[PDB]
Amino acid sequence: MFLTSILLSSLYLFNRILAWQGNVKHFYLFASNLLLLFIVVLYINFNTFSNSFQFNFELFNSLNPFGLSNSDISNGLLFGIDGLSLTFILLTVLLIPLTLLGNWYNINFNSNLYYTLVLAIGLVILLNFWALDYISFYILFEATLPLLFILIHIYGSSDSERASFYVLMFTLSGSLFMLLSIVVISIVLNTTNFINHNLFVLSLDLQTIIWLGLFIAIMVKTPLFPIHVWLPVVHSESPLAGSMILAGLILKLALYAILRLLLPLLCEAQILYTPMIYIISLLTIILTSLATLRQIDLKVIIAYSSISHMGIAILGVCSNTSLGIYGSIVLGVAHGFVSPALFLIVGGILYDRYHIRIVNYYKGLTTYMPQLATYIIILSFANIGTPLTGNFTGEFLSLQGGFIRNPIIGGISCISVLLAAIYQLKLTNKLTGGISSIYMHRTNDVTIREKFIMNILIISTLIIGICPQIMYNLLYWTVNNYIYII
Amino acid sequence: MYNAISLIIILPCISWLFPLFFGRQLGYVFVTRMTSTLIIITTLITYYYFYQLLGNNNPINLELFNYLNIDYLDINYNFEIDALTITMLLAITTISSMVHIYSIGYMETDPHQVRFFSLLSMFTFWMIILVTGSNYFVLFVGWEFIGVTSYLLISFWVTRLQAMKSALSAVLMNRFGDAFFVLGLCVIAYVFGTLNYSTIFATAYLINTDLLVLIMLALFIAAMAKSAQFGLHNWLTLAMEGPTPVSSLLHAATLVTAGIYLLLRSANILEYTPTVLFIILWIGALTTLSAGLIAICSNDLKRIIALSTMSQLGMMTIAIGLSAYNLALFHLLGHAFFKALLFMSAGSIIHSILNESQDIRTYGGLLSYLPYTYICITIASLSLMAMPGLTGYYTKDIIIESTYGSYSISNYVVYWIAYLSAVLTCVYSMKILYLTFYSNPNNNTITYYNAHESNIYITLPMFILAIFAMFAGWILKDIYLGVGTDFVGTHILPNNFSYFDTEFSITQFYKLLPLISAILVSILIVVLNEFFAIVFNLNNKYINTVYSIFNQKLVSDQILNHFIIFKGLVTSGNIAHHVDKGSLYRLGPVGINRLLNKASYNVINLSSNTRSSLSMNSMLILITIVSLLLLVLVMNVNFIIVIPVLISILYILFS
Amino acid sequence: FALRAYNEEKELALKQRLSQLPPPGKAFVTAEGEPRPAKEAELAELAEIAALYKTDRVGILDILLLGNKHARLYRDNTALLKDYYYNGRRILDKIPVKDKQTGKVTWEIKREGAEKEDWVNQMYFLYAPSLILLLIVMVYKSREDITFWAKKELDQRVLDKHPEINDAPENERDALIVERIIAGDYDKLASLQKKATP
Amino acid sequence: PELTPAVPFFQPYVLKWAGVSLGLVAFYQFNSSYEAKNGHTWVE
Amino acid sequence: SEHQRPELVSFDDINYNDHKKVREAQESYTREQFIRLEALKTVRKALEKCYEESGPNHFEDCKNLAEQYLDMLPTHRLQGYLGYQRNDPSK
Amino acid sequence: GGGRYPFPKDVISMTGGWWANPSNWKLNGLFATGIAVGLALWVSTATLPYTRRREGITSESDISKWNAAAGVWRERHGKISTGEAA
Amino acid sequence: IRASFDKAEEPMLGDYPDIDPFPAQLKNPYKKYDDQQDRRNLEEPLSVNDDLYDMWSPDRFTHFKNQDALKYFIGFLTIFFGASYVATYFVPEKAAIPREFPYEGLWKESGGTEKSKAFFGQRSE
């Protein structure tokens, strides 16, 4: 057979479906469920007894550009997975169909452009985890900006324009200093690959410099104090898939970037500059939580919580301990289950019904919208880290390791257990509480589409909250590769 | 196909979950009976298990699947019913079964009965998970989820605004304690590498006292929150905004006692941390005094009784600081029996009256109208006043005695503080009894025409709990307060054992004055309220202000909001505006925008006149050539001088 | 569902047949917002075209093989049925149900079934089962964690150094292996640290 | 006490969730039996 | 079962350019660390047995087991290969 | 019943709603009691093997062996007990 | 009354009305408002810091002014703890010694090793 004939069959079927029924979302949903299954098959065929990278394929080689390279000289972009990358891959295929299905009926102008852009962002994120060299990572790290800008500017809310320039300029700023560090790596080592980059022991004085450019970027993407001011706006004015994709995956890229670029190399700079990281993560936690206590827009509040949980996860991964790695990862997974549910509730339910996000209108949903109340409270108690939910198991483990590295900072950061409860329950009480708002008339309870989504995002986090050990089969190497202890 | 422990753990889970899934299909009737009957079956399992353990005392375990085995950290979902666990289960299971039967007659006419009964069984199941779990982690699960369930129960009337705010206060004090609890879990696992009771208690006699001090201080701060000692008793009185049965089950007998259970289970560690024992004692004396003073001068009914609960909890913490664990354990068991009964009688009172008021000042003389409710409340008050033969005498006087019988010299003062707490106990009890039954009426007339004893569903639980508050003490003082009991084998440090000295050193004066005073002041304040009522009605402006202090909980409720919460919200808004939306937009979008607005408007307003573009660009050539010739001249001779020339040039070009 | 159920004449007549009607978002309101404002034969006319929406008018082998000018007719004249069906479903709060025998469909109240969404067949039968497969696979790959391998290798290194235990009874080797583990070291970490030794 | 309109017990959510939960349970038990009879599970 | 028993390599005997040997040594160092952890866990289990069976006597019968656990805990734990792969102690 | 007031009927909750008492509940109550009893039995029979008494499982001779080996490891590694360093 | 925080925001209001805040908890409950629960009429202007001055905000107390409240709280606490210290100088002596135990303070059964008796040895005998 011909590879070209199979994809020509697919493209032909896609053209006919586009021409008969003038819509794509059925084909994209099919492709999304197909990718999920194919990734599951890769997990079936993935050996957990090997720290090596599997399913390697190289692209854009000199000899066979539009195919795959079997050469003895590799000058192209590399790809392949370890168990770390497979974890977030499973998170991304799991979310993409839901990010399309959270917008199945509310997009009515230029719909096919929207579902194209969503799938392109989701596929680009997926391939970023397969990346095995600094340059392929970077060119798939920066490829979401044009699509996010376009998506937000067209299908956004009132203040879409300001949000779109913010997601672009901030992320581009941090990315460019990442490019400088990568370029210094590339003119020194003369090789960029995530296979043998830990062997090369650069001088300390140069690790102290490369680290600054990598960390400037990761401050801007994660985000972290004091570059935490783009996230609330970009979430507030984005379409629902933009918010779900962002909070679920793009903020997890910063964590994958640390583990894959910054720790196996630059070890000595990590163990020297870790206390400055603890300063920054701690300020991120408390100040963003307290800033959340006095906000008015619903979607902005969920956004601030995302900054806090990422800042806890940075305490753990940057702690030089196994439990820190396994917690910071599980935070990223459970966060990418919980936060999309909340952004769905506050961005594709309430905003669809009443077209406003101010808390002052909302009150007394429990009377006419009870099922929405039940989901709000469950997700609120999972967000804050009620046990038997991954957002606790990850909080606890990261605070174990943060306490080990610096006990004072790792214990003064335990107040996140409180402050998360404050800024989330002050809101949940308002929504589920009181007499029905006079400003709001009645509308339907949650429909089955949204109930499907929230029940998936809750079953997944309850599972990893009940038996987190399932994820260890992929990560038992990764908890020890990135530990610099003599 | 029998398992006491499996059935104890699954049946409540059935009764919590099945109604939530099947309530619209089953109706509030069958749900009330199914949850009642299943929680009845559970109570029988525990009483029979209690018998067997008295016969043998080899606890059963239940080792289930692994939650986390990563690296030097094995946490399984282990479960166990030991001696301390089976006592906490006796309180929980008995009180919850009574309440499930009492809340049928109390919650009729309420539309949302199903969710109410599901939550009661939810709390029961999660406390069962608390007392059972053979590791600190399984404890933390029950700790959090009972605070969650408390939020929902206190918020059971979702329209009532004040109920919601009290729910938020309760669950945020919960997390203010749970944060420190996680800090203790992180420290326990850094030190011992595990979280289970077996390893930690087999080793705690070898590890540095500073580490156990940090651990126990954090766990105690969590217990201070839940057990509602003086620093964090705010939530407790607010938690009465919910229905009465919730007050009977949670904030009377069970949820508050979770902190005492934590300390009793960690007693094997606490014996090597004298500092925390001393703090626990003195914080408890502060509680048991402030509560009584706040109770004698209150007019709400549920408030007084919940404050009585705060006092007995303070006295249990006193005993724990005197290193007599079995005594506080016994007072827990009694305190459940003679306090849930009070809250049930309070409900039958409140419903006999037409408007469901909670003010003794408008109750009067229901004695002839409500005799059965009266005999039950006075039983509990006497079991609270340590009348002879009742459980409270055994459970309470012995703690007042060990205060004198302790080897420490400075604990003598705590005897008097406990004794003042006692005479205050007889005060506020007899106050409720006079104001509610003996006094002249103070309502209208129709209230007395329609007062009526409540149905069978209300009485029978008060009957059984009355039997328990009459007989349980003499039936179980051979197990707990006995001489060499070995049932609750906590490894007491021999140096701290004083029960023999407690029972023998004590004289007549120090064995009679509590009992004498409990009778005498009780009868006295009755005589004053009935014959010389002016004494409580002087209308002096310096007495009435002190009444205003002891009302409003020693103004702490106003200290907390204004100085902590309000100065947290303002600081939070100071942050959100002045930083997140102030300087951090200035060092970013806003400031860079203004900076570029000017710099671009000064760059382009440089070739100023369009009148002749030629001479201007020509002069620009001459300036640039001259400037470069002179700049290179300066930077040949010295380069650290040309730099400011270039800063200023950039200013001239961009200002 | 069907294979070659397309028909040209029906669509080419249905085009002008729908064009003779007023626009969908104004048919059932009559520009005032009242369902009764429409006539009765008009109402049945609309309901009978709307029932046509959920009817098999094309098949797989017809979409793969026919040309653009016909598919375009299907597209632009099916969008109208979509709009009419759903505007009437919202406004009247009825659906059009042709009963078995009588060839006359009209709006009706029954909605307890017979209505499915276009996203169900994909998700409930391709996504969810794959998630369940993922759960099963994570569970049965957890058996390949290093903790069990390491326990098995420690027992074997002990039996190698100390073969004698094998002849002892079959429910005592566990405790004997425990004793021998607690005695000494069966790790070889200091054997990999060779230059560390001075 | 008053009555309300009749409601079926076996609503779809009960069927779905119960069948899936209990089906995964049945699979776990069957695979444990296969492991008892052989050296490996079926999914292995 | 087919219990694999791989080969033990060290960083001090390999050249860092032949990647297969480096991966072998990395996996070896990590596997031996996990084995040290399992030995610690078995000590913990025996300690809990000695406590649950003894009771008040644990102070004597479990003494050496408890000291052994508290001496092993700071050392028998994951500590990673990079700090030996990127540091020669002979200098 | 007593003390009632109107309520919307379309509002649907997994719980009752308002004064929920459908005219079939005897049958549904039978189904629920049957499932609950079967679940309780399945759980008890499943958890039986995973039970054990705290004691009686491990012989004291095994404990003495293990404590001996503990002393052996401690002296091979040349370690001293807590407090001796004084 | 305009508090500190609420008149430090004067330079920033621009065109917004500089309202004088009054918490709703003190507003007359017996008046008929549109939103009877929050005690707000429909087009009532809002202060910049209304999140502090609505009903969902923390409760105010109108009896004691907060400074006198702090005086009373701390004065009660200090009285209690100072009495509890002073009364340790007015304490009688114990009528009997602490118990003492046979085998050298039970150092063996407390986990001793003949050299750590200071750490583990209980009372002499």
Ligand SMILES: CCCCCCCCCCCCCCCCCC(=O)OC[C@H](COP(=O)(O)OCCN)OC(=O)CCCCCCCCCCCCCCCCC
């Ligand atoms: C200044 C920066 C602080 C940064 C670090 C964080 C410090 C702790 C957290 C304080 C920050 C401010 C919190 C503001 C949240 C307010 C949310 C809200 O609006 O709800 C109000 C609620 C009280 O509700 P309320 O109106 O009073 O209703 C009662 C009527 N039924 O409010 C509440 O219920 C209160 C919830 C917080 C409970 C905290 C209690 C602390 C008490 C400490 C006493 C000292 C104890 C000793 C501790 C030992 C430490 C070594």
Ligand SMILES: CCCCCCCCCCCCCCCCCC(=O)OC[C@H](COP(=O)(O)OCCN)OC(=O)CCCCCCCCCCCCCCCCC
């Ligand atoms: C060898 C040594 C050489 C090294 C370089 C040394 C740097 C010397 C820089 C001086 C050269 C002249 C450029 C000065 C900027 C020009 C405009 C200006 O004067 O700034 C004022 C501007 C005014 O703001 P405002 O008060 O609101 O408006 C009324 C002004 N009459 O201010 C503002 O808009 C508010 C400022 C807020 C702070 C923003 C901080 C942003 C920092 C990142 C800047 C990145 C962009 C750099 C632009 C380069 C332009 C030359």
Ligand SMILES: CCCCCCCCCCCC(=O)OC[C@H](COP(=O)(O)OCC[N+](C)(C)C)OC(=O)CCCCCCCCCCC
């Ligand atoms: C541990 C994993 C999750 C366990 C499964 C829990 C979900 C089961 C479905 C509950 C449906 C329900 O409770 O109803 C939803 C209730 C309806 O109240 P109502 O009684 O029906 O009367 C109707 C009268 N209204 C209309 C006036 C209210 O909405 C609420 O008032 C908000 C309370 C939410 C209770 C949440 C249940 C406890 C779960 C908390 C665990 C984190």
